[PDB]
Amino acid sequence: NRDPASDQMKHWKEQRAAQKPDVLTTGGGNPVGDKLNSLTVGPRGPLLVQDVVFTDEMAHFDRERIPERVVHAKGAGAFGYFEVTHDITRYSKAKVFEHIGKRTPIAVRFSTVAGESGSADTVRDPRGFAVKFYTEDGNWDLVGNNTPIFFIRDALLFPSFIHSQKRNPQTHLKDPDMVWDFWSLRPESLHQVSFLFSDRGIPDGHRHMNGYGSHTFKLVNANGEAVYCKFHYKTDQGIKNLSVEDAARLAHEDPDYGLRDLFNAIATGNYPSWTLYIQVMTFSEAEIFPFNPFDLTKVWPHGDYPLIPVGKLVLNRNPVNYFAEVEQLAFDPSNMPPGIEPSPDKMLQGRLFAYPDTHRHRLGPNYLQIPVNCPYRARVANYQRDGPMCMMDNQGGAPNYYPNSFSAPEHQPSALEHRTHFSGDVQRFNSANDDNVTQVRTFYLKVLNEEQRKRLCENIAGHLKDAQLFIQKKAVKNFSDVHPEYGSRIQALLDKYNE
Amino acid sequence: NRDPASDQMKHWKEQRAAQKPDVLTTGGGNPVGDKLNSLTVGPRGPLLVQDVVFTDEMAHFDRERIPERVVHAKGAGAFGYFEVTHDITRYSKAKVFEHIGKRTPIAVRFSTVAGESGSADTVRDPRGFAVKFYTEDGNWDLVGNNTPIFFIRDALLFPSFIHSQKRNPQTHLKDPDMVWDFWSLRPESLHQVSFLFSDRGIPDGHRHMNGYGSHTFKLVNANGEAVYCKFHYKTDQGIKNLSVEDAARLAHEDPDYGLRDLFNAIATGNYPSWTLYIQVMTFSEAEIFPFNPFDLTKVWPHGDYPLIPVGKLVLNRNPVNYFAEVEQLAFDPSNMPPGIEPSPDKMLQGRLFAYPDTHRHRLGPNYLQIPVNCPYRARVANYQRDGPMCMMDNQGGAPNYYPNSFSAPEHQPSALEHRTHFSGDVQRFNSANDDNVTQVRTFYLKVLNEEQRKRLCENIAGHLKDAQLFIQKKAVKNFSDVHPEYGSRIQALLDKYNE
Amino acid sequence: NRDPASDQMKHWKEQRAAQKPDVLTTGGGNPVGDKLNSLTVGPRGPLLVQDVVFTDEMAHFDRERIPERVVHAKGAGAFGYFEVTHDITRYSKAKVFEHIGKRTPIAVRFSTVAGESGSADTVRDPRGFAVKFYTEDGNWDLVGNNTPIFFIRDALLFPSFIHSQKRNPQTHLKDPDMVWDFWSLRPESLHQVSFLFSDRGIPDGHRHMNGYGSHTFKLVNANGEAVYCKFHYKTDQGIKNLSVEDAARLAHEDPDYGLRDLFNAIATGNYPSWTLYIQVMTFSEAEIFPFNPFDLTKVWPHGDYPLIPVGKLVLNRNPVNYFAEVEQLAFDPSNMPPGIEPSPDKMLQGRLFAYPDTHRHRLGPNYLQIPVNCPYRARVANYQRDGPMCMMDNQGGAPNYYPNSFSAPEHQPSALEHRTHFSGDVQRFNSANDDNVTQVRTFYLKVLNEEQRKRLCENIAGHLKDAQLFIQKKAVKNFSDVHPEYGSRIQALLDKYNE
Amino acid sequence: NRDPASDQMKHWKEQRAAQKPDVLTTGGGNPVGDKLNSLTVGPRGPLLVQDVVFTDEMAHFDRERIPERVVHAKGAGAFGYFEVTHDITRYSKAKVFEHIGKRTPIAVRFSTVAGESGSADTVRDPRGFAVKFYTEDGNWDLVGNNTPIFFIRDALLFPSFIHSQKRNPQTHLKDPDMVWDFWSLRPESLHQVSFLFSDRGIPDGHRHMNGYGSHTFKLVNANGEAVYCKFHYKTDQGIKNLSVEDAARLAHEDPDYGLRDLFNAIATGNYPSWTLYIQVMTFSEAEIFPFNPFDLTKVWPHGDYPLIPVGKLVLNRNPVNYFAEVEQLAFDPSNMPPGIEPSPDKMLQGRLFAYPDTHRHRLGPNYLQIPVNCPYRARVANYQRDGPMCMMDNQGGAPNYYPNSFSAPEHQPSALEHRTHFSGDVQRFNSANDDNVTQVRTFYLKVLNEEQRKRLCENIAGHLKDAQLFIQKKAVKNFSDVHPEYGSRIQALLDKYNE
Ligand code: HEM
């Protein structure tokens, strides 16, 4: 007897023993008479096109694959619910927060960032932690990571950052000179790079890590009053990490470690859960905040902005068909119910467009009619019609133009947005020189102990040693700009690694 | 008060008078507060990305269109049922003929051939008359025309023929030189051409024309015995045609004449219905038949192969959304249930590959998961998985391979195909010289009368006159090869049209 | 002999009389030995899969079609050059205006609006008139119509308007109730509706109509000084229209009238040409302008803003292949070279997204690598990589991220945008009741004469009569609000039409 | 200084030091003035739509990915030439074998089978060895593996075999039960499984393994005479293998080991090469051969059918952009020049369809117009037109139908296929019980030595122990059917592994 994942088929049969097997058909419902031998003219003769049983099956086999996600391609998924435990109705009128005890169906997808579909799970990388809330106001996607910050703060650098984290365009190899040339030319990355080369850069699966919206968002209550917030969801199973040596063994021992962990957990009843907190900032506090409160490379410290609890995320169901329910999951930061809205965070302003854009490419123009993506607890009605692979009644014979004298859907004025005043030149403002070291200094000195600082440097040096010396020299300098002992330790190790 | 088609929105509003209008939402189910005005900075300022209401609506509008059909693009649709009235179980075991009184749902498409989506209905053309039977053993797609025959008899000429009947690739205009250079270089077209330019070239809407499967097909009964057959469905409303004069007036007074006629008939309860017949040829009649009995340019004469009634087709329901239910309809001649099998007709052997093929391009790899296309009266079960726009549970966690020791679906030996014996070289055989005139001579002399022959010639000369002289000279010789006076009449009228 | 279009194939053969015909191949370059007869076992036997010549040719015929344009689907194309004849470098620094005498290649596509691929040319509808300039600074797409104004002034209403002008979702029939329910609930349409039912609603081919940029745009000279502008290109062949009586004859006698008139002109050396003008409005004239200067239902009167000439548009070359050079044409308003920039027109702003969006769907992710869409007089170099159907070297092994230390492309600071100050609430501002009648009154009284006013009203009532009475009454009211005699005339004609 | 692969960017900058960096443009050729900061309203404001520099680049990033190969996804590419060295023109007329010394440009792709794009290179799996010859008669794709044989012999079992070799449809994990349930239910796989689990299951990269075409193919000479042949291309660098211990270290130390080993070799002039041999079986010897000569699970022994040399394959060029030259590479077995034809092999017959079919999905309808797929040594001319992403003239204004009297391409009769006689019932013949053991027994006893048999069983037991007991027992039985001591040794080690 083995773990539950290995016994998948065994249980599919047992859960079925009472029935007779189904009749094996074509895609058109036509029963198949023999599907092990091809129609040929004679035992050693050629194949006929009259063999449409072969063409039907092969034709579909040939179209099985769709594009993998451009980022966060290697993923695990699970489904559960969100349950409200505390009252934050003064801040948000979102129905998903309406009363204590309110449950809402969720779907979660964990991921790495850089590796493709066949890569290993226990590698150094940020982790995705995307959560979709099926509310009565339409879906709410909270596309968060295992970290509160990112490496950049303008969306126009993002394709570049990703390119520098993936394969060299000629050799198709991971290229340290690309990784570090970028990071050293963009020191705003220093904060998240210090998180990444810490211990938490390799979590022991998906259940022992925290999630964060990382972005500043906006909450609007019933009076029309607004505050800015951060979301934190913290692991009730406790932070737990793999060491470098153990992560490396599992990388070839079990490439799908974090997939198998999550599936087995839920199957054995160990339902992982997370505690949803927010931080709140008023509009006033936002004007006096020392840094840019919409700079994704900055946290809101806890002492000044403590955590307010909201509710629990619980995962208690495994997917049944991985493709249908995880590969085809699509999270849009732009899916926001009334009560939740976006900040002016440059990076989040780019994500408002990019996600729906790529989903119409990766999955298709009507990807929101796929079941896991459908807002199935909301009544979807508008003037949008047709498109490839239209799957409902296409809203029937309703008038498809607005306004109209024939009683099709109407706009709901109470769902209008919060009005904010802005003034300034319409212009590309340079955010490369916002504070890039202060919060990092704090992390290095007051969050890490001495042993962790030591490991931080060894993990950095073990990867940076493969870059050229002019890149090393520049990266080390950025590290000295945080703390001279941060830089001179790294440089002591590189001096050895360089023989 | 007007015809019922014009009152569609009027009635749509009346059937809703009681309830309230729906909440107008995004495709994500998020209610919109205002959808007549965009999100801008100040009344005369620029448009914001934050306006995800606009993006969501505009983006879908931008994706409304799919590739029209490559032929038969102008279409009208309706729905109904097939009812058995006579017993032909001695020839076929197809569940759709199981017993008298048995109904099966059907869906029909009427079309022209050459015109694109906006072309007129009342033009000289063949008419598609495609019928989809939703049976228990999967779907059965009788994809016929309003002719028993076609212009050619080898599929390799089909892309060519169609190119010649569409727009010149530089000027994008209808070209008579193309049209008649082909027809006169392939005189196998004489038989169908004669049909086209007579009175039935322009039927008075789709309810006053017959439908034929034109190919020879194979029926198989419960003992394993097989016969060949032809399908005829004859209009119970009576053949009725339009004059060249009236067809040309309506071509600009109502380009959608046939579409309108069908909708209004059904809406006022005047339901159209056809009578399905079959002809039956034994295998040993097929060896002694004077022509090639699988020649798609040949009919089976009635005197020797009389019509055997089978039942009624009845259209009694209009589509609710034309796009979802008519435009996305996909018919595959290779959708054949046990009891119905292909002949060796070279032209039908091509259509077994072409239709599924083009449907994966026009509609999508999983187009059979579109409702109106679905085999909703059978159980689809097999080892096909994934593909873009997967719309069911993707078959669940069922074992995806075959054979297996876990009781996934099994093959049904009774559904094997009938086995024929064939012997001969594997090579390309020349069919350009099968009897191209005999059955036409009969049509011209014995079926048509004096006035119809006169009109047949006028209609041909009135379109052949715009081709070059060397092309007219050749066409006329092919016509002369049917009957001297056939050519003589056309050539006398051409001598006049050429001033 | 016949017109030059009809003789296209004749001339192709003549231009090749001297050579031998090419060898006919598969798409893989494998010569074909027979393509009229299919590979079969015996003369009357089944088709084989081994017949890759059939499948290679049938596979591509099955994928011949692409989605037609969602609007303006029916179009005609030609190519030529733009030439500067006057100096407007004090307003715009764009390299297409640099000096008198400079020539830039162009590509033009004329079109109707609503009719699909097969509809008639000679119908009442606006006419598209899009102009692609191939600049050294990249492409410039002046996507114009044959009117200065449009029916609506907010992009959100654009799907609706179109839906109302196209087919009823259930009957697939042009619906008068949809047309006028919309127009009568949105009286901003009054201006362009009076343009459309006037003599210029049906132009006599594409050479006898003007072209307008319609939108206000922004020009920026070398000093950084900016003005607002309007592009008018006026036919050098003279305004010429068709009467309702003749347009309806041709609509069935020659559906492709405009397409034939443009090819035949060019082929016979009668090259059509236009004269490009601008209006100019300083930022300070924009502030005092009585209406909203960015309202697309409004014109700038000539007395206050006279026409300034710029150059000539000349069309002097037909397409060689219509699909590759016309059907696949893609104009993006957003393609704007330094010195030409958008105004805050709500409609234009919307079009900045729409066109690239739909072109990725209609043509594909890399649609700008199609030769006719290529900026083949600039040097494209950036950090975009891959995609479906990637056709060049994909920019080689160049570093693919930015910034980088390995000398891949750099930004050009002189090509930054003009900076404008905006201030206001971010909200949805209601423009429904900007002045809707003033400039229409002027048109009805001062531009048309007695006869033309008569025909304008007969054309409006000849179409509005089919709508319901409550829709009629409302429209007429909207027409009275322009002038009592406007709506009263229409109402007198409607009274007769309603028997 | 480092290896060449890591100095890629270093050498790109050096090879450019003379010139100045290009101007960074949009896709449309428009220079950008700042691509590090986004267009906003005030420094902490929201993002505008008229930031088309952002949109244009993100929209393409969002569409960088295409579908991965449905098998053999992980790959490494190189280009070179094929040079004839011996005269086989008595067997084949193919222009690639015309004379000694004749060179042809080639392109080769190496791969594994079951891992996705991200997986490691040093795992136990077959290896792809696909060769594209660009001959004057079009392209010749020889789609070969590093084995003479394969696991199955009917293509209707392919999708299933591949499903079992990949991931569980619910857990997304590698599932030994699926692996061995399939293999133990289809003992035909015994031959190739004993190859897979010997030392050659893991090659030391791609330069130290042989190539084979596995399938019997047909050769046809200038006289029309045919023979059946096998292609073997052996490594001039020598067979060399990784041990299980080192293959696993490298699977985490360098996932891309085989890719780097090829690139560094070519870059340093150590060009790998292969020797091309054929075996030859006359049609007479094919009637008396002891097994089925077209049984993909059978080799032709060397004693009876010796290797006949042909020429060399040499890889002396790396790719410059991996995506454009290696990921978009498409190989079709059906690309076969005159002189080379398929044999009736049931598995090859299915590859004649499957590959073009998946290539139209994976890449697109016109994937043969992608440079590296272009038959650029041959002249493509025919009657195929249009399609998504049509990239050349589209063959201009040339007549698009055949036959025609206007001098478009003609068929070449000498390119016709060899005619073979076939006689037999058209049915599905069982091939499950062709001799499944005999050649395996020879391998085990006569090809392997003592040590190698021991490791063969250890490799097998290490993997089979994770399957259920009932699957183990059945697999061992199939190994006892080869040789009692084969099944014995495996059962003694499974007894230990099961504690
Ligand atoms: C402007 C900056 C960014 C851009 C342009 C961007 C772009 C993308 C794209 C195109 C995808 C693919 C989505 C799909 O295929 O369905 C994706 C996935 C994802 N992104 Fe980002 N991203 C950005 C920053 C971020 C940030 C700040 C976070 C978290 C705070 C994040 C978290 C994720 C996650 C978790 C996924 C995987 C979603 C899934 O499992 O389907 N990304 N991103």
The CATH number assigned to the domain holding B96 equals 2.40.180.10
- Spatial separation of the C-alpha atoms in residues A371 and A360, rounded to whole Å: 15
- Cβ atoms of residues C90 and C227 within 8 Å: no
**Which residues in chain B are closer than 8 Å to D427, comparing Cβ atoms?**
417, 419
In a domain, D273, yes or no: yes
Cα A72 to ligand 1 centroid, rounded to whole Å = 7
- Spatial separation of the C-alpha atoms in residues B475 and B487, rounded to whole Å: 9
**What's C446's DSSP letter?**
I
* Ligand 1 closest atom vs CA D61: 10
Work out how many domains chain D is built from and give that number.
Answer: 3
Q: Quick one: which H or E segment has residue C440?
A: helix C438-442
Catalytic option among A145, A318, A373, A459: A145
| SS3 annotation, chain B | CCCCCCCHHHHHHHCCCCCCCCECECCCCCECCCCCCCEEECCCCCEECCCHHHHHHHHHHCCCCCCCCCCCCCEEEEEEEEEECCCCCCCCCCHHHCCCCCEEEEEEEEECCCCCCCCCCCCCCCCEEEEEEEECCEEEEEEEECCCCCCCCCHHHHHHHHHHHCECCCCCCECHHHHHHHHHHCHHHHHHHHHHCCHHHCECCHHHCCEECCCCEEEECCCCCEEEEEEEEEECCCCCECCHHHHHHHHHHCCCHHHHHHHHHHHCCCCCEEEEEEEEECHHHHHHCCCCCCCCCCCCCCCCCCCEEEEEEEEEECCCCHHHHHHCCCCCCCCCCCCEEECCCHHHHHHHHHHHHHHHHHCCCCHHHCHHHCCCCCCCCCCCCCCCCCCCCCCCCCCCCCCCCCCCCECCHHHCCCCCEEEEEEEECCCCCCCCCHHHHHHHHHHCCHHHHHHHHHHHHHHHCCCCHHHHHHHHHHHHCCCHHHHHHHHHHHHHHCC
Contact B9 A385 (CB under 8 A): no
Query: What are the structure tokens assigned to A163, written together?
Result: 């390119």
Q: Does C285 touch chain D (CB under 8 A)?
A: no
**Domain end position, chosen among B359, B374, B389:** B374
| CATH code, domain carrying A181 | 1.20.1370.60
Contact C169 A385 (CB under 8 A): yes
**Pair (D81, D108) in one structural domain:** yes
Distance from chain centroid for Cα D8:
27
- Spatial separation of the C-alpha atoms in residues C430 and C426, rounded to whole Å: 13
In a domain, A163, yes or no: yes
In a domain, A382, yes or no: no
Does residue C345 sit in helix, strand or coil?
coil
Cα A111 to ligand 1 centroid, rounded to whole Å = 10
Distance from chain centroid for Cα D359:
14
| SS3 annotation, chain D | CCCCHHHHHHHHHHCCCCCCCCECECCCCCECCCCCCCEEECCCCCEECCCHHHHHHHHHHCCCCCCCCCCCCCEEEEEEEEEECCCCCCCCCCHHHCCCCCEEEEEEEEECCCCCCCCCCCCCCCCEEEEEEEECCEEEEEEEECCCCCCCCCHHHHHHHHHHHCECCCCCCECHHHHHHHHHHCHHHHHHHHHHCCHHHCECCCCCCCEECCCCEEEECCCCCEEEEEEEEEECCCCCECCHHHHHHHHHHCCCHHHHHHHHHHHCCCCCEEEEEEEEECHHHHHHCCCCCCCCCCCCCCCCCCCEEEEEEEEEECCCCHHHHHHCCCCCCCCCCCCEEECCCHHHHHHHHHHHHHHHHHCCCCHHHCHHHCCCCCCCCCCCCCCCCCCCCCCCCCCCCCCCCCCCCECCHHHCCCCCEEEEEEEECCCCCCCCCHHHHHHHHHHCCHHHHHHHHHHHHHHHCCCCHHHHHHHHHHHHCCCHHHHHHHHHHHHHHCC
- Spatial separation of the C-alpha atoms in residues B98 and C377, rounded to whole Å: 69
**Which residues in chain B are closer than 8 Å to C173, comparing Cβ atoms?**
5-6, 256, 259-260, 263
Does residue A265 sit in helix, strand or coil?
helix
Q: Does B451 touch chain C (CB under 8 A)?
A: no
**Which residues in chain A are closer than 8 Å to C59, comparing Cβ atoms?**
none
- Spatial separation of the C-alpha atoms in residues C259 and B172, rounded to whole Å: 8
- Spatial separation of the C-alpha atoms in residues C417 and C138, rounded to whole Å: 16
Please state the φ and ψ torsions of residue D420, each to the nearest 5 degrees. Answer: -120, 145
User: Which of A323, A390, A330 shows the shortest CA–CA distance to A356?
Assistant: A330
- Specify whether the backbone of C486 is left (phi greater than 0), alpha (psi in -120 to 50) or beta: alpha
- Spatial separation of the C-alpha atoms in residues B68 and A189, rounded to whole Å: 50
CB A155 near ligand 1, within 6 Å? yes
Query: What are the structure tokens assigned to B88, written together?
Result: 């032909």
- Cβ atoms of residues C70 and B64 within 8 Å: yes
Residues in chain A: 499
| CATH code, domain carrying B60 | 4.10.91.20
Cα A437 to ligand 1 centroid, rounded to whole Å = 25
Contact C369 D391 (CB under 8 A): yes
- Spatial separation of the C-alpha atoms in residues B144 and B147, rounded to whole Å: 8
- Spatial separation of the C-alpha atoms in residues B458 and A254, rounded to whole Å: 80
Q: D touches which chains (3+ CB pairs under 8 A)?
A: A, B, C
User: Which of D325, D60, D21, D256 shows the shortest CA–CA distance to A160?
Assistant: D60
Cα A71 to ligand 1 centroid, rounded to whole Å = 7
**Residue the block writes with tokens 């050579």:** C19
**Domain end position, chosen among A320, A345, A374:** A374
**Domain end position, chosen among C41, C65, C89:** C65
- Spatial separation of the C-alpha atoms in residues D238 and A176, rounded to whole Å: 33
- Spatial separation of the C-alpha atoms in residues D68 and B239, rounded to whole Å: 55
DSSP-H helix ranges across A288-417: 322, 346-362
Q: Does D384 touch chain C (CB under 8 A)?
A: yes
Which residue, among C429, C433, C471, would best test binding to B if mutated, counting the most B CBs under 10 Å from its CB? C429
**Pair (A246, A330) in one structural domain:** yes
Contact A387 B31 (CB under 8 A): no
Please state the φ and ψ torsions of residue D461, each to the nearest 5 degrees. Answer: -65, -40
**Pair (B55, B89) in one structural domain:** no
- Spatial separation of the C-alpha atoms in residues C105 and C317, rounded to whole Å: 11
Strand partners, D341: D218
- Cβ atoms of residues A476 and A467 within 8 Å: no
Cα B360 to ligand 1 centroid, rounded to whole Å = 30
**Which residues in chain A are closer than 8 Å to B56, comparing Cβ atoms?**
334, 356, 384
Residue C252 is labelled as binding a ligand: no
CB A373 near ligand 1, within 6 Å? no
- A287-305 burial, b at 16+ Cβ within 10 Å, e below that, comes to eebeebbbbbbbbbeeeeb
Q: C touches which chains (3+ CB pairs under 8 A)?
A: A, B, D
Does residue C368 sit in helix, strand or coil?
helix
Distance from chain centroid for Cα B16:
36
Q: Which residues are CB-contacts of C14 (< 8 A; sequence separation ≥ 6)?
A: none
Query: What are the structure tokens assigned to D226, written together?
Result: 């045919």
User: Which of B426, B488, B423 shows the shortest CA–CA distance to B454?
Assistant: B488
**Residue the block writes with tokens 């710029």:** C310
In a domain, D429, yes or no: no
Does residue C396 sit in helix, strand or coil?
coil
Q: How many angstroms separate the first and last alpha carbons of chain C?
A: 51
**Pair (D191, D318) in one structural domain:** no
- Spatial separation of the C-alpha atoms in residues A35 and B415, rounded to whole Å: 11
**Pair (C98, C159) in one structural domain:** no
**Residue the block writes with tokens 């014996």:** B421
CB atoms within 10 A of CB B284: 8
- Spatial separation of the C-alpha atoms in residues C391 and C233, rounded to whole Å: 36
**Pair (B365, B491) in one structural domain:** no
Which residues between 52 and 81 in chain A have a beta carbon less than 8 angstroms from any beta carbon of chain D?
Answer: 53-55, 57-59, 61-70, 73-74, 76
**Pair (C190, C97) in one structural domain:** no
Q: What residue numbers of B does the annotated binding site cover?
A: 191, 195, 198, 200, 210, 212, 234, 300, 302, 355, 439, 442-443
User: Which of A70, A76, A75, A30 shows the shortest CA–CA distance to A53?
Assistant: A30
Q: Quick one: which H or E segment has residue C359?
A: helix C346-362
In a domain, C274, yes or no: yes
Would you please indicate which residues of D are annotated as catalytic (active-site) residues? 72, 145
- Cβ atoms of residues A50 and A39 within 8 Å: yes
**Residue the block writes with tokens 């004239």:** C285
**Residue the block writes with tokens 């892309």:** B159
- Specify whether the backbone of D377 is left (phi greater than 0), alpha (psi in -120 to 50) or beta: alpha
Q: How many angstroms separate the first and last alpha carbons of chain A?
A: 51
Strand partners, B341: B218
Query: What are the structure tokens assigned to A420, written together?
Result: 């904010």
In a domain, B426, yes or no: no
- Our CA dihedral for B445, B448, B449, B450, rounded to 10 degrees, sits at -70
**Pair (B177, B210) in one structural domain:** no
Please state the φ and ψ torsions of residue A17, each to the nearest 5 degrees. Answer: -50, -25
Strand boundaries in C71-181, DSSP class E:
75-84, 103-111, 128-135, 138-145
- Spatial separation of the C-alpha atoms in residues C100 and C90, rounded to whole Å: 13
A279: buried, middle or exposed (CB in 10 Å: 19+, 13-18, 0-12)?
Answer: buried
Provide the domain limits for residue D464.
150-200+436-499
- Cβ atoms of residues D381 and D396 within 8 Å: no
- Spatial separation of the C-alpha atoms in residues B112 and C437, rounded to whole Å: 45
Share in percent of chain A as helix, strand, coil (round to 5): 35, 20, 50
Share in percent of chain C as helix, strand, coil (round to 5): 35, 20, 45
- Cβ atoms of residues A222 and A348 within 8 Å: no
Distance from CA of A294 to the nearest CA of B (A): 16
- Cβ atoms of residues D42 and D294 within 8 Å: no
**Pair (B227, B195) in one structural domain:** no
**Pair (C281, C138) in one structural domain:** yes
Q: Does D316 touch chain C (CB under 8 A)?
A: no
Please state the φ and ψ torsions of residue C17, each to the nearest 5 degrees. Answer: -50, -30
- Cβ atoms of residues B174 and C326 within 8 Å: no
- Spatial separation of the C-alpha atoms in residues B319 and B109, rounded to whole Å: 11
**Pair (D273, D124) in one structural domain:** yes
Packed helices A469-480 and A484-497: angle between N→C axes, nearest 10 degrees? 160
User: Which of C330, C258, C346, C249 shows the shortest CA–CA distance to C297?
Assistant: C346
**What's C20's DSSP letter?**
P
Which residue, among B3, B38, B347, would best test binding to C if mutated, counting the most C CBs under 10 Å from its CB? B38
**Residue the block writes with tokens 């072409």:** B354
Query: What are the structure tokens assigned to A435, written together?
Result: 């504070």
- Specify whether the backbone of C64 is left (phi greater than 0), alpha (psi in -120 to 50) or beta: alpha
Cα D465 to ligand 1 centroid, rounded to whole Å = 40
- Spatial separation of the C-alpha atoms in residues D198 and D195, rounded to whole Å: 5
**Pair (D207, D273) in one structural domain:** yes
User: Which of C328, C265, C306 shows the shortest CA–CA distance to C107?
Assistant: C328
- Spatial separation of the C-alpha atoms in residues B447 and C309, rounded to whole Å: 70
In a domain, A394, yes or no: no
User: DSSP per residue over A165-198, as a string?
Assistant: HSB-TTT-SB-HHHHHHHHHH-GGGHHHHHHHTS
Query: What are the structure tokens assigned to B437, written together?
Result: 């005139």
**C-alpha neighbours within 13 Å on the C-beta side of residue D281:** 27
CB A113 near ligand 1, within 6 Å? no
Packed helices B52-61 and A346-362: angle between N→C axes, nearest 10 degrees? 20
In a domain, A1, yes or no: yes
Please state the φ and ψ torsions of residue B261, each to the nearest 5 degrees. Answer: -55, -45
**Which residues in chain A are closer than 8 Å to C421, comparing Cβ atoms?**
423-426
- Spatial separation of the C-alpha atoms in residues A445 and B490, rounded to whole Å: 101
Catalytic option among B11, B60, B72, B146: B72
Q: Quick one: which H or E segment has residue C259?
A: helix C257-267
